[PDB]
Write a protein that binds this ligand. Sequence first.
Ligand code: ZN
Lengths: 113, 218
Amino acid sequence: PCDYPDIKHGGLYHPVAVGKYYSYYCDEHFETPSGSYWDHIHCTQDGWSPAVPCLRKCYFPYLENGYNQNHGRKFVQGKSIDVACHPGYALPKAQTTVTCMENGWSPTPRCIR
Amino acid sequence: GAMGRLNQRNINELKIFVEKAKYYSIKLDAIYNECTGAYNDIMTYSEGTFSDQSKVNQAISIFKKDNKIVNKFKELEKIIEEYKPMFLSKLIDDFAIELDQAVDNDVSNARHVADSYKKLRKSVVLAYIESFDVISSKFVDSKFVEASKKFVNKAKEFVEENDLIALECIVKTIGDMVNDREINSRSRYNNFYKKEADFLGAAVELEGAYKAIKQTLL
Ligand SMILES: [Zn+2]
């Protein structure tokens, strides 16, 4: 009922039936819904129970000519943050909000001229 | 009367300069925008917390890609080479080598590249002010040399606060002067940059001298 699982951005420590479970890890820049490097993937009713097993983490960069209170802070997929630049510089396309996503920040945070 | 003829040569050798360097801020902004990502990543991961060598390497890839950034620096020297030979030529050549010898995964190596870029950028701005300086220096109207000295001085202080904002302001302001356009003393950045107000004041004093010379030739 739950065929082989593939941990996008991770893998298994090492056909299946409901109730069985396998331990899995996340690659360097991802963590688990619990915030850990590892956890169980559980064969359930609606497939594997951690639907999305590994979730990306984003560190907010230092921004040349930016307000940089937030530089270094860590965010997790789905988390956003208010970006602002010094007068003369600006986030592109008049945007003000950047969002941590599977492949990283979107859009990328930078103060342009 | 043979003084007028010389004041005109001055005014002319200045208008030529301003026209040739007209696009200076616009090309440095271009460079800045293409590089602000890389320099950001390098500063982020040269801070002692965590490191992404892939990122710190893509940073280096953006600088060296097609020897383009270096080339865009060479274009800006070409404009000011006439006025101030081998100001920048040394520091551009130096910067190109550092990027070649840039070693993969060495973060202290990257951060040297970032600091060198950030210096080379300021140097490019200073070379505009230096080129202005050598031209206004040769003016026989003394009141203009006095104003020009003060303008150079306040210009350089504005650069040390912020090089790209100082330059766009210096280029806009002198472009206004030689085009007989009124110079506004009111800040264009809501007084965020502390050096603007006094530079604009020097720019008004220089307008006055410039406007005094032009009336000699009527
Ligand atoms: Zn810091």
